[PDB]
Amino acid sequence: MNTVPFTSAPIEVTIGIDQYSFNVKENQPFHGIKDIPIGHVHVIHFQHADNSSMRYGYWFDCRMGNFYIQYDPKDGLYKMMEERDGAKFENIVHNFKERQMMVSYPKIDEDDTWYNLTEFVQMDKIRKIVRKDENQFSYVDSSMTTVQENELSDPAHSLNYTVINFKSREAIRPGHEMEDFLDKSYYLNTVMLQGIFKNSSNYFGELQFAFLNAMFFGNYGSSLQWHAMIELICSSATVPKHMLDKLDEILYYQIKTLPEQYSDILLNERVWNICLYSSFQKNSLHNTEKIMENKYPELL
Amino acid sequence: GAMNSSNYAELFNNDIKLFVDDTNVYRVTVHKTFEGNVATKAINGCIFTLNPKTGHLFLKIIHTSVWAGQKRLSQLAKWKTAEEVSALVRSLPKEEQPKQIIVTRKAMLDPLEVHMLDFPNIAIRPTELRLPFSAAMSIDKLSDVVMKATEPQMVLFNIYDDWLDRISSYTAFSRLTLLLRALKTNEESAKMILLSDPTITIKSYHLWPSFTDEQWITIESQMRDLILTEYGRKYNV
Ligand SMILES: COc1cc(CN)ccc1C
Ligand SMILES: COc1cc(CN)ccc1C
Secondary structure, three states: OEEEEEOOOOOOEEEEEOOEEEEEOOOOOOOEEEEEOOOOOEEEEEEEOOEEEEEEEEEEOHHHOOEEEEEEOOOOEEEEEEOOOHHHHHHHHHHHHHOOOOEEOOOOOOOOHHHHHHOOOOHHHHHHHEOOOOOOOEEEEOOOOEHHHHHOOOHHHOEOOOOOOOOOOOOOOOOOHHHHHHOOHHHHHHHHHHHHHOOHHHHHHHHHHHHHHHHHHOOHHHHHHHHHHHHHHHOOOOOOHHHHHHHHHHHHHHHHHOOHHHHHHHOOHHHHHHHHHHOOOOOOOHHHHHHHHHHOOOOO | OOEOHHHOHHHHOOOOEEEEEOOOOOEEEEEEOOOOOEEEEEEOEEEEEEOOOOOEEEEEEEOHHHHOOOOOHHHHHHHHHHHHHHHHHHHOOHHHOOOEEEEOOHHHHHHHHHHOOOOOOOEEEOEOOOOOHHHHHHOHHHHHHHHHOOOOEEEEEEOOOOHHHOOOHHHHHHHHHHHHHHHHHOHHHHHHHHHOOOOOOOOOOOOOOOOOHHHHHHHHHHHHHHHHHHHHHHHOO
């Protein structure tokens, strides 16, 4: 188990850690989160009480370094940093642990939610989407745009998701116009899987990361990317059997975790009705269809 | 964007554009089989591709053999249309390629856009105008070349005959659409109107009769009376 120590909490803020949120009051004696499960990426995120504008946060893996959070009164936000002095870090963390100034990540022993949302998410692949390579952690926020959104504006502060565009020369082979538009298998299997992502684990990792960023930050372009990546699979007549099964699992736990009250702005009615009812894979996502119908039947 | 009554003069400016109509691409007769089920027999069809400024009509004849062994023919027809329009643009010198292609039915937008990804500067647009281009097969010379064809074939016409010598393209288009609307609402009457005077003939190199200016006004009036007549017979007004 690992720890993220906080210098202090000078401004009132809601703190989230993966799928959990808690409130810290202005100048309350808060000095971090402990008992963070080693083995998974994590995200620690923030919404200021005095300005719900800009949700922001940091993707990180405790195995890659000792990180902490300090408020920056010039830039006005809680920043992640790395202490390279290990001795100093253990010393800092043990005093706050002894004064019980740290809340405990509530890692229930009967719960696999976080694993199931991050199964294919690895820091190495996150750092290719979010470019800021002087740090071992990655900052995301509500308003960061995607490379595709810039095409349609700072490239340093962008989310470098893989662009998916069904009416593009990459998606459509000359001479197979109708075939490749109505059956996306070429684009999914040869262009994206074999050519760009290399395997389905990297493709699912980007998918899962796009959902998490949509949900935790309300990042609109991440939400477009998640829906695009689903639709490409569902709109392909030929998909490996193991990807369809794993996709059904991925989506089931995303749908299960989505707040009911965010369903109107996080779920695209067109994509989901197409995917579950019209597409080639309409019958291939049993778990996801069953949860969608019992949870969000309005949308369908 | 969509083409409508507000930007109607854009059709007749000096930016090359084509209308594409696919109504008559896939044509069938429906008949009972010996066992009393129903089956279709396809007949020859055509793509109607028209420069509304010049009157140049690129009539691509669609021979029934292009459907042989194919499934979902109504859907294939939109893509076959888009393939043939793309082929036409590619066959034209650069300075003759259209800057815009306007499809008369919105179902043509994706198939054409996909076939023309190579031409990102050509705008593919729908229109809110209800154009009567489906009646193009009521023009005897066009119907004849379509039905006689034994192979795929493209035939080129000027659907304005020589009118542009005397009127603007705006007026020639207005004449054409009223003629086609009339043939679409009551074909027999429209043809009766067009030929009742044997002293006005159709030149071998033309589609419509050689009416004088004065006779065109009369003809136009009679066609409007016909469209109004039929509206009356239809709705009982
Ligand atoms: C919150 O923990 C730390 C604080 C400082 C300096 N505020 C340095 C390093 C660490 C670990
Ligand atoms: C108080 O700290 C926590 C609280 C909850 C539930 N609001 C979840 C997780 C943590 C760390």
